[PDB]
Design a protein around this ligand. Structure first.
Ligand code: NAD
Ligand code: NAD
Lengths: 299, 299
């Protein structure tokens, strides 16, 4: 496979690299000049390791979207050239509702949305830390493309990304967004990692409240979350054995690297929909308002 | 007057000292052994720079008792001084609903609740910083005790505490608790002072939301806040000219001194009442949960 990764940040770089290591032709596409230049010159360095991946500024058979949700539109705009008739598009971004923009730019038949449990940290231009284990879930939005989705899952799993087809996917995106709509904001705002958060006495109440707001909105979309499971899934992160000692990626984005979060595409999406469906979502509203206020307090 | 001050912390000490200075017989009562011992030995030192040896007793052992504990010590303090209760009780604590506990221990005829705008910092055992100007508002609970309330206001004003009778009082307590239910939690959780907070883009929305939750509950108590004014009164604190550059007292309690907050007697009280009266108060619920989680994250 010839593969573009549009957004070879932290997570884009994880994937880019594992696909080039198993012997795909990987082309990274990024918007960050220094990262690019650095990688043209010295390759991509990682603590999983070096690899000279081809890389191009933004201004193949498979394109894999891995921008932040907020760059995503401009990135599409800047790569519409590579969106040909054959050409498959995969979103594994962490929020909710990316399909809507992706649709503007790529035929429905060719779009595949999903989730990943893989992690990754971008230490600096050209440099990444590649944490632990992981998995992928993905499904096709296009009519009767369930078979090519299973091949895409299969091609990816062959590079060790351990990916699976899903017949729900919107269940799975909501279920994961709940994890992103709790651990993230909470850790960010409270200045704690996940383990410390679950040690506090109100974490459970806060998590449950939030999960319910997510589930009432999803229900409107005919998507019925097993709320006790989803809650136990969010609470799973409290475990110091597993990921407990890590800070979630939103904390990293803002508190560690002084960059904006994806909060509008997670808890904020839930609010946008609460408005539209007439469902109260105050905890998402406030959590969103809190994170933006926190952004403003630092930049 | 013979006067006990039950809770001769920062604020209790301010009052204790100004009432002794104008010539009242003041007995401090406190629960903090070192503070006591220190004041038995060296008196009370204050940077108003002045000293006074005030009689002071641990709370295992007058005409007017003045409650000035933190709202969380309050019950145990009552319990420990029921002996001293014709016996006259004043609350000037910062939360809401202290009448209910005070009632258990003292006849209704004798209870007077209120507010103060005086400030005071306790630097260490036996030591206080006493900052700038202030005032008091108070009223009687107790049928037809309007006249003794005006004397109490008068006796206090004669020591320079500049106190006034009020015929609303429950308006005035709620109106102030709004300011305490916003600047406090928000500063504490965001790690910003007030000026920085009002600079952020979501401070106004967060404040307005909260004030409204305060005003819907108050309404059920037949108390009708002028919400725009109360909001402008909370937002007044954003001004760097006035108090903008200060951190509020809850921030000081927890972030600076690693001591618990009064959040359950402010935003928490609003939530306890929301439950009762069937009024949604999620922003107070969540702000309360956030501050407790924060407490737990530090101990
Ligand atoms: N990193 C994680 O562990 C994690 C986990 C699951 C899902 N995801 C999802 O992956 C998507 C991307 O995550 P990510 O870790 O790559 O974010 P990331 O910022 O590392 O990179 C996203 C993109 O950001 C650009 N970027 C990063 N720093 C930049 C800078 N300083 N200037 C200009 N552009 C810059 C990158 O170059 C890349 O374009 C997000 O939706 C995220 O939620 C991330
Ligand atoms: N301090 C202010 O400027 C201020 C202003 C307006 C209203 N108030 C209200 O008045 C009430 C009294 O407030 P405050 O300023 O005195 O509380 P404070 O904590 O300074 O003192 C109150 C009690 O806490 C105890 N305490 C303080 N430090 C301690 C320590 N290190 N170890 C053990 N015990 C300790 C004190 O001895 C005293 O018993 C509060 O509800 C507050 O909201 C305070």
């Amino acid at each position: 496979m010839k593969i573009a990764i549009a957004g070879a940040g932290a997570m884009g770089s994880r994937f880019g690299l594992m696909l080039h290591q198993s012997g795909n032709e990987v082309l990274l596409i990024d918007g960050w000049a220094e990262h690019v230049q650095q990688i043209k010159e010295h390759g991509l360095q990682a603590n999983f390791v070096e690899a000279k991946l081809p890389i191009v500024l933004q201004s193949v058979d498979l394109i894999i979207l891995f921008t932040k949700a907020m760059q995503l539109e401009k990135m599409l705009q800047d790569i519409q050239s590579l969106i040909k008739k054959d050409t498959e598009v995969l979103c594994l971004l962490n929020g909710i509702g990316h399909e809507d923009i992706i649709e503007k730019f790529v035929p429905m038949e060719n779009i595949y949305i999903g989730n990943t449990m893989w992690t990754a940290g971008l230490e600096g231009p050209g440099q990444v830390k590649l944490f632990g284990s992981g998995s992928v879930e993905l499904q096709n939005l296009g009519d009767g493309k369930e078979a090519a989705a299973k091949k895409l899952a299969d091609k990816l799993s062959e590079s060790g990304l351990n990916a699976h087809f899903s017949d729900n996917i919107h269940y799975s995106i909501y279920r994961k967004a709940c994890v992103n709509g709790t651990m993230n904001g909470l850790c960010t705002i409270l200045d704690v990692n996940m383990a410390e958060l679950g040690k506090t006495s109100t974490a459970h109440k806060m998590v449950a409240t939030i999960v319910n707001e997510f589930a009432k909105v999803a229900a409107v979309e005919k998507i019925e979350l097993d709320v006790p499971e989803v809650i136990a899934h969010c609470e799973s992160c409290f475990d110091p054995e597993t990921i407990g000692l890590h800070y979630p990626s939103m904390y990293q984005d803002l508190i560690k690297n002084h960059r904006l979060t994806e909060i509008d595409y997670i808890n904020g999406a839930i609010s946008r929909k609460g408005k539209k469906y007439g469902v109260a979502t105050p905890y998402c509203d406030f959590l969103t308002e809190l994170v933006h206020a926190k952004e403003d307090s630092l930049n």
